[PDB]
Design a binder for this molecule. Structure first.
Ligand code: CLA
Ligand code: CLA
Ligand code: CLA
Ligand code: CLA
Ligand code: CLA
Ligand code: CLA
Ligand code: CLA
Ligand SMILES: CCCCCCCCCCCCCCCCCC(=O)OC[C@H](CO[C@@H]1O[C@H](CO)[C@H](O)[C@H](O)[C@H]1O)OC(=O)CCCCCCCCCCCCCCCCC
Ligand SMILES: CC(/C=C/C=C(C)/C=C/[C@@]12O[C@]1(C)C[C@@H](O)CC2(C)C)=C\C=C\C=C(C)\C=C\C=C(C)\C=C\[C@@]12O[C@]1(C)C[C@@H](O)CC2(C)C
Ligand SMILES: CC1=C(/C=C/C(C)=C/C=C/C(C)=C/C=C/C=C(C)/C=C/C=C(C)/C=C/[C@@]23O[C@]2(C)C[C@@H](O)CC3(C)C)C(C)(C)C[C@H](O)C1
Ligand SMILES: CCCCCCCCCCCCO[C@H]1O[C@H](CO)[C@@H](O[C@H]2O[C@H](CO)[C@@H](O)[C@H](O)[C@H]2O)[C@H](O)[C@H]1O
Lengths: 158, 199, 43, 207
């Protein structure tokens, strides 16, 4: 397939690795009583391992000659679940955090001693600003349009 | 008149009640800036009218065919049908026809009265009006633009937007169309809800 | 007093401790419900 | 309505300066100072008045069915397991309906605490309304059909104190029933008969 890689659901090395891990777990499982707690924990680990391999196989990942999954990040539409969609989620969350921080700093700077409100948080004020990160992409865009996001170079100084 | 979306809450200072549909609802302070308010006022009307049209033309054919007087596919399959022209041609026609009308609408938002003139026949124009509510040709029967009618339009548009969101979400979990989902709820009301859908 | 204890509970290290504890709990529970994820498979 | 010469929870002790025997049921008990600031005092009063009525409703519906079953008039099952049985619909589908219906009333009550007197009128028919005049004590044909809530400020305080004390008792009774069911392993009414049969050995130390 892409870059000489093979789908993990059809890779012999992938199945070999799964079998080796399951055998290694079963060798430890064969040391305890069937109804003891360690046996149940090892059995749960075995079931989890089988589920992990099955999900990797059926989610469309690609495997190399080593028998391990590899990620594709060039933009191909068959692999957006690997980088692009989680990346959009990361950007959304990070923008929320940054936007609420900047809005708190701007709202608090008008007081007599703003620094006192930076080592002791005003939770009453922050609890009104936290929910507003929900629409940060709209607010930031509108603020950029109207020229409220950036300070002119002439005005920057201590 | 100006009501309250939440009985017992104070209204924002910038929502004094000079706009149709004012109910003091802006918890996240999107419209604190006066210009943002105008932009959102226009966007509300546009997204709402499109949603109303979409819901009507998305629901009526289904019930018409289910009655038995027509044989048409569901709304989520009509894009995969046989038409006299391919989908690409229709998209290109749509894009070309819409760039013109949308920039024409944009130029009036930027400065009212700028694009009232007819380009070809230099004898027709639009009399003075308010942005979002033109008249003349766009009002053939020449109804009365009273405050009551604007509120009646806004209420149905706001309802239609939620209806379209509901259709979109209900298709991605059930996959059987709106009317089938309604009849399933009406068959066993206590055993057919969203809870049974996920379990 | 209640005013003073509410003021002390709002100091930076205490609030950081509480916030990070809650976030860690949320992430641990999510990883217990949807374990061993390398991609986003829903859509 | 200050009344320093009133019984307290601990004779010989000084009552806190923020309690002066105005509210019904006041006995000068607040060791941890959770109501020193007057703003939170109203919130605490409302919370107690709500917990009390919930506990009273729970207690009145948790012992009488058990007593009737013990006598044999009714055949209701154990209260401690009735949540895990099967009913006409799914148990999860009842919780959401409960949430919606109770949330309407909870928000309607919440609006009155912040803005008193702002939710006293029926939203549909603007003629019918409630005659209550104090926060937490509404009044009308819906909540006071007999008309016992209108009296001089002598019987009103005594009735409120009666309600507060009958609710404070039930608040402890419900938790006691829960702990007994979890620890003893049988019904609550059976525990009373066990204690009245051998009142020297049938106690908590028996297990
Ligand atoms: C300089 C490196 C570079 C850059 C900047 C891009 C950029 C892009 N590539 Mg990639 N690509 C590259 C190199 C690069 N590629 C190389 C070298 C190859 C050959 C192996 C490919 C093969 C490739 C394929 C096969 C595809 C892309 C696609 C894309 C697009 C995905 C964007 C998108 O829809 O995000 C989504 C963002 C939001 C929804 C927000 C984007 C324009 C995809 C596309 O549709 O391109 C038009 C696509 O199908 N690329
Ligand atoms: C309000 C928070 C905030 C915001 C919006 C920014 C924004 C920015 N920072 Mg700054 N920064 C912050 C806090 C913040 N910083 C803090 C607390 C530190 C001390 C560690 C730094 C240290 C720092 C460095 C060393 C650099 C930047 C840089 C940058 C720029 C690029 C982004 C970057 O590299 O970030 C990287 C920054 C971090 C990983 C630091 C952690 C940021 C935290 C998580 C922010 C939120 C914490 C805060 C307590 C939340 C309060 C919430 C409120 C409701 C009470 C950008 C202008 C870079 C720059 O100059 O680019 C041109 C750069 O080199 N920042
Ligand atoms: C948002 C507006 C909108 C759009 C984009 C469409 C689009 C479509 N309609 Mg619909 N329709 C609309 C509004 C709309 N309709 C309205 C307001 C009505 C009046 C109730 C109808 C009544 C209608 C009928 C009766 C039929 C369509 C059909 C169609 C399809 C082919 C006709 C065509 O577009 O040429 C196409 C998917 C035809 C089809 O095959 O639908 C599946 C069809 O039979 N439409
Ligand atoms: C506002 C219009 C509206 C109406 C009348 C319905 C009606 C229905 N929906 Mg739908 N739904 C809506 C909006 C609506 N939905 C929206 C906005 C969403 C996205 C969150 C969904 C998501 C959804 C799912 C995922 C499912 C349904 C299902 C159902 C059916 C069973 C009831 C149920 O479980 O609801 C569940 C309700 C919700 C998830 C949220 C509803 C939120 C709306 C805005 C409340 C409207 C309140 C308003 C006062 C009601 C007016 C009633 C009437 C006068 C129009 C029922 C026919 C189920 C089905 O298909 O059963 C066969 C089902 O599985 N709906
Ligand atoms: C930059 C470094 C980096 C990166 C990119 C990763 C990435 C990853 N690590 Mg690794 N890791 C790292 C460093 C890193 N790690 C380090 C330094 C250590 C040592 C301390 C580890 C130790 C480690 C372990 C032990 C494990 C991982 C695992 C993982 C995976 C976690 C996936 C997950 O939990 O998804 C699920 C989580 C989420 C989706 C996050 C959701 C966040 C919130 C709740 C979103 C809310 C959105 C909200 C609803 C709004 C949207 C809706 C909108 C409509 C408003 C992922 C591939 C785990 C794994 O499975 O690997 C294969 C795993 O077991 N890592
Ligand atoms: C806090 C109030 C409360 C709550 C949550 C419940 C809840 C319940 N009661 Mg109870 N009940 C209450 C007060 C309450 N009761 C009161 C005040 C009385 C009068 C003494 C009763 C008398 C009563 C009877 C006679 C029965 C229930 C039963 C039930 C169950 C089904 C209810 C139904 O079908 O409707 C349910 C566990 C039924 C049950 O347990 O079915 C197995 C049942 O038979 N209740
Ligand atoms: C007012 C409520 C109340 C009442 C009347 C009773 C009564 C009884 N309980 Mg119960 N109990 C209660 C509250 C109550 N309990 C509470 C709050 C708890 C949790 C701490 C428990 C935990 C509990 C256990 C674990 C056991 C009992 C048991 C018993 C029985 C034997 C006495 C005993 O060992 O007490 C032990 C007492 C306690 C562990 C603490 C009691 C604390 C409350 C506040 C005392 C209130 C006294 C009250 C003011 C006196 C006047 C009442 C008035 C109506 C006249 C008896 C029928 C035993 C049983 O089942 O015997 C068959 C038993 O095993 N109770
Ligand atoms: C169901 C019942 C179960 C059993 C219940 C047992 C209750 C036993 C109570 C014992 C008696 C306690 C009396 C406390 C009175 C208030 C004390 C006080 O003011 O604390 C308040 C003080 C500090 O608070 C300061 O008090 C000052 C008094 O002049 C000023 O008011 C200051 O403004 C205030 O900040 O807290 C402590 O000293 C706490 C020490 C222990 C740590 C907790
Ligand atoms: C114990 C309790 C609260 C106790 C509080 C205490 C001691 C506080 C003490 C102090 O703060 C003071 C005053 C002053 C401070 O200075 C000092 C301290 C010491 C800090 C609440 C219980 C509160 C208990 C409540 C609300 C219980 C509700 C129960 C219900 C509704 C039950 C319903 C059902 O039983 C039915 C009817 C039928 C069944 O089939 C189904 C179910 C659901 C089981
Ligand atoms: C207002 C407000 C807020 C809330 C905002 C909210 C909830 C906004 C919600 C907005 C929504 C749902 C908008 C939805 C718009 C939907 C639109 C335009 C839908 C259009 C649909 C069309 C053209 C459909 C075409 C078709 O179907 C047909 C016809 C026939 C089919 O064959 C083909 C397709 C294409 C499917 C907060 C953010 C919460 C706080 C703030 O402070 C105040
Ligand atoms: C694929 C994506 C394509 C995107 C294409 C569209 C890009 C649109 C860019 C809009 C830029 C808006 O911001 C840009 O103009 C603002 C003025 O309007 C500038 O704002 C500046 O001038 C304003 C007056 O006009 C002052 O009030 C501001 O204090 C000053 O910063 C911003 O410093 C500049 O960055």
């Amino acid at each position: 397939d892409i870059a000489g890689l093979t789908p993990c659901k059809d890779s012999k090395a992938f199945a070999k690795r799964e079998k080796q891990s399951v055998k290694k777990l079963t060798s430890s499982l064969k040391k305890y009583a069937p109804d003891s707690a360690p046996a149940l924990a090892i059995q749960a680990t075995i079931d989890k391992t089988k589920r992990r391999f099955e999900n990797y196989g059926k989610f469309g990942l690609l495997c190399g000659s080593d028998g391990l999954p590899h990620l594709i990040v060039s933009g191909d539409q068959r692999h957006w679940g690997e980088f692009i969609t989680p990346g959009v989620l990361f950007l959304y969350i990070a923008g929320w955090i940054g936007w609420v921080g900047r809005s708190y700093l701007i709202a608090v700077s008008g007081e007599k001693k703003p620094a006192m409100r930076e080592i002791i948080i005003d939770v009453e004020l922050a609890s009104k600003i936290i929910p507003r990160g929900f629409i940060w992409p709209v607010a930031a865009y509108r603020e950029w349009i109207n020229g409220d996001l950036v300070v002119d170079d002439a005005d920057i100084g201590y | 008149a100006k009501g309250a979306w939440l009985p017992g809450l104070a209204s924002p200072a910038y929502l004094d009640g000079s706009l149709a549909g004012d109910n003091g609802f802006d918890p996240l302070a999107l419209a604190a800036d006066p210009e943002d308010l105008r932009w959102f006022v226009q966007a509300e009307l546009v997204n709402g009218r499109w949603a109303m049209l979409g819901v009507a033309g998305m629901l009526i054919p289904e019930v018409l065919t289910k009655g038995g007087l027509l044989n048409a596919p569901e709304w989520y399959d009509a894009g995969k049908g046989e038409y006299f022209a391919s989908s690409s041609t229709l998209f290109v026609i749509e894009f070309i026809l819409f760039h013109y009308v949308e920039i024409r609408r944009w130029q009036d938002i930027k400065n009212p009265g700028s694009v009232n003139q007819d380009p070809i026949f230099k004898s027709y124009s639009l009399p003075a009006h308010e942005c979002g509510y033109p008249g003349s040709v766009f009002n053939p029967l020449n109804f009365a633009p009273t405050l009551e009618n604007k509120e009646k339009e806004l209420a149905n548009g706001r309802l239609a937007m939620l209806a379209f969101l509901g259709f979109l979400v209900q298709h991605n979990v059930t996959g059987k169309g709106p009317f089938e989902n309604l009849q399933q709820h009406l068959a066993d009301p206590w055993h057919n809800t969203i809870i049974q859908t996920f379990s | 007093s209640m005013r003073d204890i509410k003021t002390y509970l709002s100091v930076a290290p205490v609030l950081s401790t509480l916030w990070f504890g809650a976030l860690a709990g949320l992430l641990i529970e999510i990883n217990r419900l949807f374990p061993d994820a390398l991609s986003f498979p829903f859509f | 309505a200050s009344a320093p010469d009133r019984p307290i929870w601990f004779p010989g002790s000084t009552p806190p300066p923020w309690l002066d025997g105005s509210l019904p049921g006041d006995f000068g008990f607040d060791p941890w100072g959770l109501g020193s600031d007057p703003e939170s005092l109203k919130w605490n009063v409302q919370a107690e008045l709500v917990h009390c009525r919930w506990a009273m409703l729970g207690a009145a519906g948790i012992f009488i069915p058990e007593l009737l079953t013990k006598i044999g008039i009714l055949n209701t099952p154990s209260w401690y397991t009735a949540g895990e049985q099967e009913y006409f619909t799914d148990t999860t589908t009842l919780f959401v309906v409960e949430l919606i219906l109770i949330g309407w009333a909870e928000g309607r009550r919440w609006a009155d605490i912040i803005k008193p007197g702002s939710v006293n009128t029926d939203p549909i028919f603007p003629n019918n309304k409630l005659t209550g005049t104090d926060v937490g004590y509404p009044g009308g044909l819906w909540f006071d059909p007999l008309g016992y809530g209108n009296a001089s400020p002598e019987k009103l305080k005594e009735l409120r104190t009666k309600e507060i004390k009958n609710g404070r008792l039930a608040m402890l009774a419900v938790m006691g029933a829960w702990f007994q069911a979890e620890y003893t392993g049988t019904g609550p009414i059976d525990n009373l008969f066990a204690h009245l049969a051998d009142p020297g050995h049938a106690t908590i130390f028996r297990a």
